[PDB]
């Protein structure tokens, strides 16, 4: 699933079957398992994918097509092809989001009063995904979901068969990529509160390099996800962590500025902020993970 392009890839055996009373025969065999060059001499339905972007039909080594004619006139026509379909995603809970990628197909040039589609078996058992058939690295296929409907176009009504594959993004990559460095940078920023107040360049470079780390983190984590125009969950996490790091630096600036005039106040604000920051960060972590894991 290419998240940056809002699309997915799927390799399928696409099977169609209809009844053609002009292809009745009577011979010793009851089924003719013919070639893939006989299917061009006869009528075959012109199914196209409503949300397919650039699909291919494999031609290696011969055209990967299949034509079977049964003695009573039934035709089975199978193709092997790679659909590259469009999956509109709502990345509001990224990277803890679930999707339903569709695959709509129907008939081009044949309205509902001419060609209708139907599933050959029970609708729950028609689209079948293989067991070892998963090239997903970032998602997890949960199941499939078929449907059938009618769309009203400028040229007539068309039967449209929809198939939804339900996907759930795996967070294990993004944890180590973004959620662990941000938390570690927040901890590295908060560890500055334990140094003595007489070493001001030390705590300064602590704060400033944590701010630098958070900025480079937000940039590196934003360049993975496509350029959406809203805030995801990872964006909110990075924003709150940046707020915590920057607030820590502001607390250090306050402690240093209050030194040499009121030492007791600086001591108080360094002792109070030594425990309020991990407490606040832990409550934020608890609330954030609770609202985005049960979402």
């Amino acid at each position, epitope marked *: 699933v290419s998240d940056h392009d809002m699309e997915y890839t799927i390799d399928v055996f696409f099977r169609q079957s209809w009844k053609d009373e002009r292809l009745k025969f009577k011979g010793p065999m009851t089924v003719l398992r013919l070639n893939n060059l006989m299917a061009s001499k006869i009528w075959t339905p012109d199914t196209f994918f409503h949300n397919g972007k650039k699909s291919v039909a494999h031609n290696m080594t011969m055209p990967n097509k299949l034509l079977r004619i049964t003695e*009573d006139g039934t035709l089975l026509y199978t193709m092997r092809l790679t659909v590259r379909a469009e999956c509109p995603m709502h990345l509001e809970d990224f990277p803890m989001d679930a999707h339903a990628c569709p695959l709509k197909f129907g008939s081009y040039a044949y309205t509902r009063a001419e060609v*209708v589609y139907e599933w050959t078996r*029970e*609708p*729950a*058992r028609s689209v079948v995904v293989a067991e070892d058939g998963s090239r997903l690295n970032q998602y997890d296929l949960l199941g499939q979901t*078929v449907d*059938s*409907g009618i769309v009203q176009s400028s040229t007539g009504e068309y039967v449209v068969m929809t198939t939804h594959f339900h996907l759930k993004r795996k967070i294990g990559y993004f944890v180590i990529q973004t959620y662990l460095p941000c938390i570690m940078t927040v901890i590295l920023s908060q560890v500055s509160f334990w140094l003595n107040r007489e070493s001001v360049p030390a705590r300064t470079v602590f704060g400033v390099t944590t701010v630098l780390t958070m900025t480079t983190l937000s940039i590196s984590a934003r360049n993975s996800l496509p350029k959406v125009a809203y805030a995801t969950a990872m964006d909110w996490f990075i924003a709150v962590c940046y707020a915590f790091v920057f607030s820590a630096l502001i607390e250090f600036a306050t402690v240093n500025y209050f030194t040499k005039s009121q030492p007791a106040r600086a001591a108080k604000i360094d002792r109070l902020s030594r425990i309020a920051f991990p407490l606040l960060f832990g409550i934020f972590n608890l609330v954030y993970w609770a609202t985005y894991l049960n979402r």
Partner: antibody
Amino acid sequence: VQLQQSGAELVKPGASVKLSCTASGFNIKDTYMYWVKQRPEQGLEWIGRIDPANGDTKYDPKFQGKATITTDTFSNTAYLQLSSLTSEDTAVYYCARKGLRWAMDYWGQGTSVTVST
Amino acid sequence: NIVMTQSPKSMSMSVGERVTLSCKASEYVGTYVSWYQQKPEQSPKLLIYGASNRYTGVPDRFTGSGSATDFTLTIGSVQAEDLADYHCGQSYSYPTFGAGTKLELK
């Protein structure tokens, strides 16, 4: 177009019954054939279905092992055989075929089996 | 086994008024819910095939409304010949029907 079933049966509990459903107006190799049961003043219950062009059959979990559905293509007939029927399956047995949006558009006429001594 | 729950189990209503029957599914059934009508001592008749598609020979007073789980069958001007049973059945998986609803007159 039309499905015609056989008459009612009055059998003894512990025997086997074979019900028939003859199709007129279409070839049964193009659709599925369903058997449904309906008790007096209750809802329908799906027994099982058979794909006559293949022979593949599926059954309801409360009917697996009890009923068996076969087909005769040369005369367009679907058969339902119940193996050992007890004193509770006194219902009406309908024969249906799949329709447009996987609905049962054409139904039979019902065959009311009756078990008693 | 997808269970279809139909409500109400029995109802009465007069002539020439809108009436609505509901069917609720446990699992997802896309648009594969069908509505059958069964008069006493007769075989069921398909009224609505799929969610919101009328069968050939059904009056324009029956209309269905579909969703992922919630389905309705609405009759407009209900006549005196609609004294029958109405079943909802799903076809997304191996077919299961509802319990039934007995329409009555008053």
